[PDB]
Design a binder for this molecule. Structure first.
Ligand code: 0KX
Ligand code: MN
Ligand code: MN
Length: 379
DNA sequence: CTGGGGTCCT
DNA sequence: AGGACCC
């Protein structure tokens, strides 16, 4: 009952796409910028001291020759993301999306088929593809080792098909659950892959230096844990289950403490088509209801094109704003006749609705720093 | 000088 | 509606 899971994360995703569009960027330190944030950078810029999510001020301070490309339009990145996901769905149907650039694939059934097609003379010729975490020795008589090696071969075929068909590189990790497959994928970067044999699990789990590095333990949970003297993976491993339950609830406590041991029972879920579409816009200041109406119009145009391309109709609309110096949202169902009309001047009705919601949140009789629109409840 | 997105749970 | 998490 031991699964084989692969996790794939693309190398400097946005920067890789922009480097594909303009090959002249391939040999220069490249950073992809959104507002005042260098959201990612190619390997050249990373060598010169630029890091992901660094200030544009600090990024040019570390590397003044940095070339900057605007990436506030995620259209290309989204297209390429779904091409990667589809290509992986060619291998096994059940592919889970995390972010635009990460995918889990459950290789168990495929691995089993490959092993059944094999015979004894070949069964000793099974070899790993890529790195083995911690240089750990392979025991070809351990069925888990054999299955994970086959999983590494499948992962290699996946990366190669990604480069040949899509011109994209990434790192893969092969393990027995999603947490470990994600934790081991980034050990060797970029454009490499790593397989984790069971014997090294604990090693991996103890190579982390704080609990926030565990997928599942975010900012709030991390701060609450720090408030209890829990700072290492082993602190959380050994901490009292009961105090943990009282401090975080039963759910969070049991899940994250089981995560501290490298145990992740969660299955790989079919992500399928998106559950929502949304567009954002940030600014230093918004003070005019007419200006807010214009920005909202902008968001609506692109969202309408996207939904029209999708072929499904959203049955709920949401408006989100941020106030000066928290985020607030109002949503409502989309009228049925507008839903059927999708594909007339749908603009005007939609703008009227979202303006009504806006007035519900804001008093025209202000200073806003974020306007966002969402289409959810897709059919 | 802190983006532009997504998921699910309450 | 808001909040936790993910990239
Ligand atoms: N907070 C974040 C994190 C990622 N992203 C976008 C930019 C990234 O190119 C893309 C993937 O994020 P990422 O995997 O965390 N780092 P990236 O893939 O750029 O480089 P690697 O570290 O994976 O080589 O999502 C973002 O816009 N905001
Ligand atoms: Mn990633
Ligand atoms: Mn990545």
């Amino acid at each position: 009952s031991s699964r084989v899971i692969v996790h794939v994360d693309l190398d400097c995703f946005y920067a890789q796409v922009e480097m594909i569009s303009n090959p002249e960027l391939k040999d220069k330190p490249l950073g992809v910028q959104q507002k005042y944030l260098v959201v990612t950078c190619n390997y050249e810029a990373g060598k010169l001291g630029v890091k992901k999510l660094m200030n544009v001020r600090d990024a040019k301070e570390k590397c003044p020759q940095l070339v900057l490309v605007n990436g506030e339009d995620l259209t290309r990145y989204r297209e390429m993301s779904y091409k990667v996901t589809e290509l992986l769905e060619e291998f096994s149907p059940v592919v889970e999306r995390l972010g635009f650039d990460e995918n889990f694939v459950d290789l168990t059934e495929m691995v089993e088929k490959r092993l059944q097609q094999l015979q004894s003379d070949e069964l000793s010729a099974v070899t790993v593809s890529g790195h083995v975490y911690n240089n750990q020795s392979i025991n070809l008589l351990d069925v888990l080792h054999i299955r994970l090696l086959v999983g590494s071969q499948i992962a290699a075929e996946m990366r190669e098909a990604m480069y040949n068909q899509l011109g994209l590189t990434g790192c893969a990790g092969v393990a027995s659950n999603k947490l470990l497959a994600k934790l081991v994928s980034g050990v060797f970067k970029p454009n490499q892959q790593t397989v984790l044999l069971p014997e090294s699990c604990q090693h991996l789990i103890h190579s982390l230096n704080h609990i926030k590095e565990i997928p599942g333990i975010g900012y709030k949970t991390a701060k609450c844990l720090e408030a209890l003297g829990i700072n290492s993976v082993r602190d959380l491993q050994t901490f009292s289950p009961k105090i943990l339950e009282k401090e975080l609830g039963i759910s969070v406590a049991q899940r994250i403490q089981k995560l501290s041991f490298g145990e992740d029972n969660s299955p790989v879920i079919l992500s399928g088509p998106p559950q929502s579409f949304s567009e954002e816009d940030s600014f230093k200041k918004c003070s005019s209801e007419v200006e807010a109406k214009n920005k909202i119009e902008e968001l609506l145009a692109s969202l309408l094109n996207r939904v029209c391309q999708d072929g499904r109709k959203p049955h709920t609309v949401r408006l989100i704003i941020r106030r000066y110096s928290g985020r607030e949202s109002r949503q409502c169902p989309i009228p049925s006749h507008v839903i059927q009309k999708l594909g007339y001047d749908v603009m005007t009705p939609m703008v009227d609705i979202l303006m009504k919601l806006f007035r519900n949140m804001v008093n025209v009789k202000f200073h806003l720093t974020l306007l966002s629109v969402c289409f959810c409840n897709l059919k």
